[PDB]
Amino acid sequence: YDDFHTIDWVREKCKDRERHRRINSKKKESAWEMTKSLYDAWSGWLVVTLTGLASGALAGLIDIAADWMTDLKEGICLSALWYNHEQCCWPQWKTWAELIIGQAEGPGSYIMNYIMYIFWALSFAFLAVSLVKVFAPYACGSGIPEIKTILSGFIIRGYLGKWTLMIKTITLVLAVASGLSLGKEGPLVHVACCCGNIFSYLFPKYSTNEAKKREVLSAASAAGVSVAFGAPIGGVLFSLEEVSYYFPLKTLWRSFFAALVAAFVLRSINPTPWYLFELFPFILLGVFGGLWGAFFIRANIAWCRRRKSTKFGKYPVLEVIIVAAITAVIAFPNPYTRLNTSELIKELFTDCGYSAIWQLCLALIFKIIMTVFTFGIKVPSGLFIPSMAIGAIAGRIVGIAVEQLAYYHHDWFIFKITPGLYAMVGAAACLGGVTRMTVSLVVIVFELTGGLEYIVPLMAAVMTSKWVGDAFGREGIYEAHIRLNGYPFLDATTLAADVMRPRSILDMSPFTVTDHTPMEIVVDIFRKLGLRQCLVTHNGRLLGIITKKDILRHMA
Amino acid sequence: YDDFHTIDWVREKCKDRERHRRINSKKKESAWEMTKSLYDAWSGWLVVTLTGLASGALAGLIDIAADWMTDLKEGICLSALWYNHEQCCWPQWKTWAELIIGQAEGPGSYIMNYIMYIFWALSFAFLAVSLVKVFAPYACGSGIPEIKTILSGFIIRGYLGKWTLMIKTITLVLAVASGLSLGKEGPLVHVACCCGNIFSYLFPKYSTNEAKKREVLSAASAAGVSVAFGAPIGGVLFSLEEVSYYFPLKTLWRSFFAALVAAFVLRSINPTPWYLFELFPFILLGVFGGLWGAFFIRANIAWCRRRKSTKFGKYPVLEVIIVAAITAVIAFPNPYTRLNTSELIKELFTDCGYSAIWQLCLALIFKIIMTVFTFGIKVPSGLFIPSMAIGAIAGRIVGIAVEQLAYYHHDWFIFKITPGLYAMVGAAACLGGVTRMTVSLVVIVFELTGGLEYIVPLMAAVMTSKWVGDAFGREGIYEAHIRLNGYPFLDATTLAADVMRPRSILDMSPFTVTDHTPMEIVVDIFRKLGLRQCLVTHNGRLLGIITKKDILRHMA
Ligand SMILES: [Cl-]
Ligand SMILES: [Cl-]
Ligand SMILES: [Cl-]
Ligand SMILES: [Cl-]
Ligand SMILES: [Cl-]
Ligand SMILES: [Cl-]
């Protein structure tokens, strides 16, 4: 296959079985051959394990460097120059103003801090876009859409290579620390799959074949979601639901091992009940979640579809610099948009132990705008953590509203409340209303805290979010960005006449369909079997051909 | 399709989609039609839920009645005639000897108790076999093999009906209380699937089609395993791994809801760390588990294959009576085989707070013999709980051996121990060495207690058990009993020439395969697409045919 060509799944199976026959022919001869056979099976298993280990280590390293640089934005701890703001306190911390001006508070100190924050955001974003564009342009974007296309038989050559992995890790640290409204969670699905591909080359079962490396990539997507959220079961379900549609009963256990290994290695790397009357707020958040998703999926796509039909497409670096400058300028004054979005999530998910509503509302509006304008620019811009932050801010605003309403009106028969729970519900609602996921997401949240008492709220909000978000288009953000890039991804009354062109190497087993066959049956054949091209005959006459491209063109 | 014919999966899909088209044609017209569409989707969901509820209620009711009758074997509590031995103590309890003879201990009292125990075992077993043979012969056996064949497109008409369900429930209570070395766990997979089928008839989406009820049966098998072990995730995995091989991403969430609902309703119905040096014992149990399975699968099958080639086949009732008489005669004297096997498991899994080894060894030998001779006779004989009891007795024997060895030799550098953990490990090893399951089983055990500290022992023992049991034949007990009954179950170098016969209703879309096609490709096409018969052409000539029967004969 040449680049950007979908794979003939049947031939992948045939060559796999031919290698099985070759190996098994000599397997029984000598003890070394049985050792080699066990070695091949355990080689599949070490591919899963190495993917898990590397994904965990890279997720941990990205987390550490992202935190350090995000805090470097606004100060430096003179004691040790390798601790962040919340690490050398564990006077010691001196922001840039007193480092230069010498004083703590005052108009001059504030202006100096503001300028330094803007400059550091600009410099980090500029480095991110520079490195990605110059060294590995395949490192931009969340990277899950093309992974779903790759697992669906597509070839993008350098999309999961060494250079894409290196530049995505570096520029994902830099883009997280630049303050852009993006994440390092989906990008970690892409980085986990980059590890999966890079390790598949080690062993001959997967380096030679394309079906087997698609299995390994399923496992790697599971591991990536695990490290992204720290939810091994959640990562397995995320691979199951969104990133793949081929699970031959094995690339579930292998996904689970990858996810568990990655979560454990991530952990190593570190140098109150709700009342029934709250479901109405919880469901409310769900609806908001849905709307968000819907809005986003339209708006963002429009923007991306506009970036390909105007000057922007030729100006990536200027775009990233401008977005980073606007983000930094409008983010600093507000003490909630200044914080790392992950730090804002940790702050908004926790319980306390009018200004808050105003500042949270401003944070919400700013994040909603800047994620629409951010997701897509040429930096490793994930989409889990800013969707969670938008949802969490909305949830906490609703929780504070409930607190005030109950306190001022507790005489109501309804009440006769932990805002952290509202933040969790809103985050799950807004994360499932975009990506259009139902259960994997709820499971990720359940393992994100472990409490079983929040399954009803989370399930209710996530389901409502998906139901409301589907009313504006069934396809999610990661599939609506395939239908935009026009990849040949076959989504999982007409005949074969309507979709047939024309209007030692001889493949001796071409699967044929009669012209009178329903089209839906041919689509089903391609989906279940993954055929690349099927002849269409009339009474056994070499009459026409159908290819995935033809089916897709009919779909479009 | 007539009885005992496998289904053409493609036509099932086609009729399903035709019903979708018909419904959607009128769906948008009036609000009632949209309500009907939502009603159809939620009808699939209420089928899952009703299956879960009925399975939970029947599992609870079977548990209650089985316990009461098992204790009725050996006494009666005069205060209330609806409590068991361990329920009216919660002088009150008078065994048959003091009820009739009037005295408690003495040769006469013991003989009277022994005779009463034997007589009650005989009467319960005789009722079990009588009812099954006279009213519903489809109620015998574990019932999972034919369920795996049914989910694989087979028709057995009355195998999942009202009469099979009623008689399996009644005779499963009676066969559990008769002391036969059998269970009510696998039988509960069959009873859950009987509920699934009986409820599929309620709604028109599933009553009309065969693919859709196969999905419902997947969900029902999940619910049945849930009630059997009280492990909803374990039940979902058991359906995933053993009872089905079609999971279109939906009959996972539906399986999970069925399993959760059934476990919860079952709950409603109720009127120490291990040291590293123990893995060597744990793995040892695993090996034993494996061997057991292997032995059993051969031995039992031989017996079953002998029951079909001798007088036995014409004498079911005499066989059940004789087996029950021998079981009762040899079980009473020993205080461990006298107890309900579930009670023996609850006792062998718990910690204390030379006679024991001898009596546990006698229990083990007796159970190993009587389950080989029992599984198969015409009573609802499950195979989970006696395999677990054999494994638990072996595990506890090993745990006691470890206790004695360490106590008498603690000076050994190895030690410088909870037998309940050994019982758990042995039960899991012996249950996975028979059924050849790896992860579903470990997950069931993990949820059977909830402790995470026992995942390494259980995983090690179960994996070793499967590896050792596969060395004597890959097929498990529930598939080796399909290859005995010869059902057309397509298990998930030659051409189509080698396996082709001869050596408004016109189906207009027959899927041809060229004579030069590899056989493996045709088998794969049948498996992934579930075709019933495929033409085979030479240069588009109506040359020969292949049917599932032909492929199966080829393997046979
Ligand atoms: Cl992307
Ligand atoms: Cl993210
Ligand atoms: Cl993402
Ligand atoms: Cl059976
Ligand atoms: Cl059982
Ligand atoms: Cl069973």
Swiss-Prot record, chains A, B:
Signal peptide (residue range): none
Domain of life: Eukaryota
Residue numbers binding chloride: 142, 384, 478
Residue intervals of the CBS domain: 506-556
Any GO CC annotation of this UniProt entry: external side of plasma membrane
UniProt-annotated site: Mediates proton transfer from the outer aqueous phase to the interior of the protein, residues: 185
Short motif (Selectivity filter part_1): ranges: 141-145
Tissue localization of expression: Detected in kidney, in the apical part of proximal tubule cells (at protein level). Expressed at high levels in the kidney while a low level expression is seen in the brain. Within the brain, it is prominent in the hippocampus, cerebral cortex and olfactory bulb.
Membrane protein topology class: Multi-pass membrane protein
Marked site (Mediates proton transfer from the protein to the inner aqueous phase) residue numbers: 242
SMART domains, sorted: CBS (SM00116)
Keyword Transit peptide: no
Short motif (Selectivity filter part_3): ranges: 382-386
Pfam families (alphabetical): CBS, Voltage_CLC
Positions that bind ATP: 547-550
Motif extent (Selectivity filter part_2): 183-187
Regions that enter the bilayer but do not cross it: 144-151, 216-228, 232-240, 420-434, 438-449, 450-453
InterPro entries listed in its UniProt record: CBS_dom (IPR000644), CBS_dom_sf (IPR046342), Cl-channel_core (IPR014743), ClC (IPR001807), ClC3 (IPR002245)
Any GO molecular function: ATP binding
Cited function: May influence large dense-core vesicle exocytosis in adrenal chromaffin cells.
Protein name: H(+)/Cl(-) exchange transporter 3
Species this chain originates from: Mus musculus
Gene from which the chain derives: Clcn3
